[PDB]
Design a binder for these strands. Structure first.
Lengths: 174, 97, 137, 76, 115
RNA sequence: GCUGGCGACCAUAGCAAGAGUGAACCACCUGAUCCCUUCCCGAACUCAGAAGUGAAACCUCUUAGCGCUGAUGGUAGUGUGGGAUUACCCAUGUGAGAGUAAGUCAUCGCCAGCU
RNA sequence: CGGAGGAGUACGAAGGUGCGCUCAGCGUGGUCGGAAAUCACGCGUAGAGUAUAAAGGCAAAAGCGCGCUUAACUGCGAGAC
């Protein structure tokens, strides 16, 4: 996107939401991708498979996430790997955003999963997408156990309405 | 007007712990008067007069008059100290009204 | 038998009972109250007995506020034991009473009945008491 | 039989030189388990939080700083 | 806003150590547009020499890169030699010792201050 | 009279709410070619620059809203001599804490720019 | 022979230095995932931590990471407790 956003959506959203100054036009700052792969301690291979998955889906190297505090109810320890996370900004973030919105959403069997709600009350949106499939990589064959992704778009928008407006302008279904 | 208390000046040699105890042994009550635009004034009151005034309910909400000779003050009751076991009043505060 | 649910320590020093009760000497919850005039100790059984007498007399027509709690443990030796060999065992709990401390308050009854109940209760206590009523200041 | 009956030897902590006294370099000013007093000018701190004078002069206590710490210093 | 707070937090330790040591300080400041350098006495409340790219001789240039910082360092060195200060402690004020500030420090060192 | 830096001081100086400032300075701001950088990300650090904005931020102003400061008088305690033993009284010296009246939206120093 | 607790160890890094970073709690949303795993954003706030008992301490953090290393050196030592 990038240039397309800068050309159209800036002025379009400015006149749509009636904002006086340019500096507070809503923008997207970062996108975070997470796989909370619990109980990786037993297998030690699903986690490194997940990091590979992240590497193919987004052209950035993942960083494994260590546990904070130990809980008896679960089996996690003080500081051992229990997850993986990635952050995307700049042109790579616009890329991932477009190649996700245009392609992945029609692919999945169900539809209308993402409601116009679920903003955190300050203009940032969170979604969960199931199955590493529907992404530009190999299908159920040549992959390890299936996995799910959490996608968070963090915006400069102050209110949920302004966040919704920015997302629908790009083409978020709801 | 309706409530009037006759008082005498309480001097520095009449202030303190032992002096106050001697005054109460003589059946008197120490009081202080403070308020806007004037310095505090220390006075002595009669125990029977104070008890009689406190028995009435209008004493706590009406302007009272304290007369030390020629000097006259119009004040409201502000704070009162009582003995923990005998309930006898021990010291009084008066805010200028 | 009032007693703390748990304590930080089990045994405490004897101490000394001195001074007056400047705190807890004003009628706050009800309209009429009974307060101590000389110092002493009050046990949980004494508290229970006085409460039972007051409640029985007033027939539970008003509300009784108890303002003393026995948070001090007292120990004793097992009997026929020589001096030394450690501190004794906790037997009962007491509250220290200073002159001017209010023990019971009653809300919602006539003064004649409240005074008669307080007179009934005062015969169960190991120190002298008196009756007070609420006042503006 | 009691399970109590132990205690440790005394340690002799506290202030050794008070305000207004003259010192020579090396004199110990405060013995302390933690840092109740902090080192000001011409005062050094040992590995066990002892405060000592590093120059001749007169001892002076004060309260200073944004945290309200107690300082001791030596004026030459 | 945590940017400036983090910078001051980073500068605190070096400033306190210099104050405890009791030496003359050479302090620098850097913005996207300008760079500044002042020499401060031991007490910390008086300045002896100063230099910046706001100087009339230098304000006409680009003012925001290594080349300007070089002459800023030369100027502060030559002005401090006039005041008679020789030994100083460099205070980077929470910045990294890299790029423009490193150039300014090298220029002052060639100017004659030893540190 | 404004702006920046460095100190004295550490709430009577702080928080909170509301309102202003772009000439200069500062701040966001452009992109990432070289220096440099992230257990990933030009988000921070760094470099090369002025097309935009004072929106945010930082400063300045107003408010007693929260907080903070705080008398006088009295009470508790207490050294010495005397009188008594549920821990008080007298002579003499000393004197809180809590609470009340009231106060407060700081005050100074060195240097450099702009009027 | 009063009332309560600990020790008879550990560590070549858990030592040195340069540079860098702040805890805990609650609330929102977000797959399995919930009372409580990880992600993002807020609110008030030292209640976290410090190999180990308690106490005195801890923002230049004495708490937490990374690179390089052996000052866990030799001869001493004014002056003090």
């Amino acid at each position: 996107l990038k240039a397309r956003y800068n050309d159209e959506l800036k002025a379009k959203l400015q006149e749509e939401l009636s904002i006086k100054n340019v500096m507070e036009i809503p923008r997207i700052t970062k996108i975070t991708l997470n796989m909370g792969v619990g109980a990786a301690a037993t297998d030690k291979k699903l986690l490194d498979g997940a990091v590979a998955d992240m590497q193919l889906i987004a052209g950035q190297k993942p960083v494994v996430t260590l546990a904070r505090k130990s809980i008896a109810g679960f089996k996690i320890r003080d500081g051992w790997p229990i997850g993986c996370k990635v952050t995307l900004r700049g042109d790579q973030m616009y890329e991932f955003l477009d190649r996700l919105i245009s392609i992945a959403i029609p692919r999945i069997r169900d539809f209308r999963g993402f409601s116009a709600k679920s903003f955190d009350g300050r203009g940032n949106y969170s979604m969960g997408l199931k199955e590493q499939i529907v992404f530009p990589e190999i299908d159920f064959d040549k992959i390890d156990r299936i996995r799910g992704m959490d996608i968070t778009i963090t915006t400069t928008a102050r209110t949920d309405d302004e966040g919704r407006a920015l997302m629908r302008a790009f083409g978020f279904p709801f | 007007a309706n409530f009037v208390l006759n008082a005498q000046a309480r001097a520095e040699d009449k202030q303190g712990k032992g002096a106050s105890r001697r005054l109460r042994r003589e059946s008197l009550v120490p009081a202080i008067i403070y308020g806007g635009n004037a310095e505090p004034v220390a006075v002595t009151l009669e125990l029977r007069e104070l008890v009689k005034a406190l028995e009435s309910n209008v004493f706590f909400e009406e302007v009272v008059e304290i007369k030390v000779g020629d000097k006259v003050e119009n004040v409201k009751i502000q704070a009162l100290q009582r003995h923990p076991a005998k309930n006898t009043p021990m010291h009084a505060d008066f805010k200028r009204a | 038998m009032l007693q703390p649910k748990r304590t930080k320590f089990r045994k405490v020093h004897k101490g000394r009972n001195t001074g007056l009760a400047h705190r807890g000497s004003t009628v706050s919850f009800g309209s009429i109250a009974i307060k101590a005039t000389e110092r002493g100790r009050m046990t949980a059984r004494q508290i229970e007995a006085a409460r039972r007498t007051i409640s029985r007399r007033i027939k539970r027509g008003g509300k009784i506020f108890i303002r003393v709690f026995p948070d001090k443990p007292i120990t004793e030796k097992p009997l026929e034991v020589r001096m030394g060999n450690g501190k004794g065992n906790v037997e009962y709990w007491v509250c220290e009473i200073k002159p001017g401390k209010i023990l019971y308050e009653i809300e919602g009854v006539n003064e004649d009945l409240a005074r008669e109940a307080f007179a009934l209760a005062a015969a169960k206590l190991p120190f002298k008491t008196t009756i007070v009523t609420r006042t503006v200041m | 039989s009691t399970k109590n009956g132990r205690d440790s030897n005394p340690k002799m902590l506290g202030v050794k030189v008070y305000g207004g006294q003259t010192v020579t370099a090396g004199n110990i000013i405060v013995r302390q388990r933690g840092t109740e007093f902090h080192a000001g000018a011409n005062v050094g701190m040992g590995r066990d939080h002892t405060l000592f004078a590093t120059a001749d002069g007169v001892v002076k206590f004060e309260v200073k700083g944004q945290f309200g710490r107690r300082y001791v210093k030596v004026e030459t | 806003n945590e940017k400036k707070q983090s910078r001051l937090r980073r500068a605190k330790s070096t400033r306190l150590h210099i104050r405890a040591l009791g030496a003359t300080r050479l302090c620098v400041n850097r913005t996207p547009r300008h760079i500044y350098a002042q020499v401060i006495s031991a007490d910390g409340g008086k300045v002896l020499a100063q230099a910046s790219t706001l100087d009339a001789s230098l304000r006409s240039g680009t003012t925001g890169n290594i080349e300007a910082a070089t002459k800023v360092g030369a100027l502060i060195a030559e002005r401090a030699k006039a005041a008679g200060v020789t030994k100083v402690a460099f205070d980077r004020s929470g910045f990294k010792y890299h790029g423009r500030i490193k150039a300014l420090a090298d220029a002052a060192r060639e100017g004659g201050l030893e540190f």
